Design a protein around this ligand. Structure first.
Ligand SMILES: [Mg+2]
Ligand SMILES: [Mg+2]
Lengths: 160, 161
């Protein structure tokens, strides 16, 4: 049950735009960077970020998918690999993504961009770019919807 | 060579004593928690923490040892809070491998990380839950940690190696 909407299409749009500028900024350009989306919605976010970045620096950035969910390629070695996910929670999915990435190559470094951080981490992993911090109880859940797959851009808190 | 002393013995003691209190606080006591040191100095730090924690809560805390080295102990893990302890957080690559090791021994309820110093320049989305001191450094500088159990003195210093 949709207990509440915390981000509308507008907030999402402006969050991803800022994030696009932060990525370019913290890497002093996009040279050697690659956006790898985790899971369904993570991939769509990575693409939007890629598109935004392209229309700011004039140069485009490679995008990869990589599948996880409690377990085509893309440049990895000596590249700045930016994992992109919709929701940061326990951090366990991200840990798996890192190992996966580490087996495909030796990246200069791995960064983490997420649309929302709902707290409750169970590993010492933090996102380098956060769209919005959304406090939540352990009993609540986060639902992220994007136009490409859900017919709408929206983030909400759903009770159990 | 040693450029400057960023932490002296008293600072190190005050940093560790506080971390001990921070650990108890965030976990509301140390039950179900385990201290796992990484390499030599990490182990000595983890031991100091456990000694401090027990005198505070009157409850003993399990200390483990992990030998994690990258190129260029028993007990519980499953359903426990494994608190990794290291002297310096840098690229974060060592902690990531250390987490792999922990996962090979079981599934902890969670993993935390405590370090004496964070010198920035991470190359992985890994951050410490408890930090002794944030020490800014250039990529040309180096951190040198000396603990009395191995170097006869407690001291943190920046070097231009
Ligand atoms: Mg996801
Ligand atoms: Mg160490």
């Amino acid at each position: 049950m949709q207990k509440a909407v915390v981000m509308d299409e507008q907030a999402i749009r402006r969050a991803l735009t800022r994030i696009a500028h932060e990525i370019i900024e913290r890497n002093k350009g996009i040279d050697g960077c690659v956006l790898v989306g985790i899971k369904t919605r993570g991939i769509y976010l990575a693409r939007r970020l890629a598109e935004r970045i392209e229309q700011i620096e004039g140069a485009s950035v490679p995008v990869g998918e990589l599948d996880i969910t409690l377990y085509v390629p893309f440049p990895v070695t000596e590249r700045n690999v930016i994992l992109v996910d919709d929701v940061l929670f326990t951090g366990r999915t991200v840990r798996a993504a890192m190992d996966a990435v580490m087996d495909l190559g030796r990246p200069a470094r791995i960064q983490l961009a997420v649309l929302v951080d709902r707290g409750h981490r169970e590993l010492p992993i933090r996102a380098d770019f956060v769209g919005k911090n959304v406090p939540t109880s352990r009993s609540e859940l986060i639902v992220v919807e994007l136009s490409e797959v859900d017919g709408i851009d929206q983030v909400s808190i759903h009770e159990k």
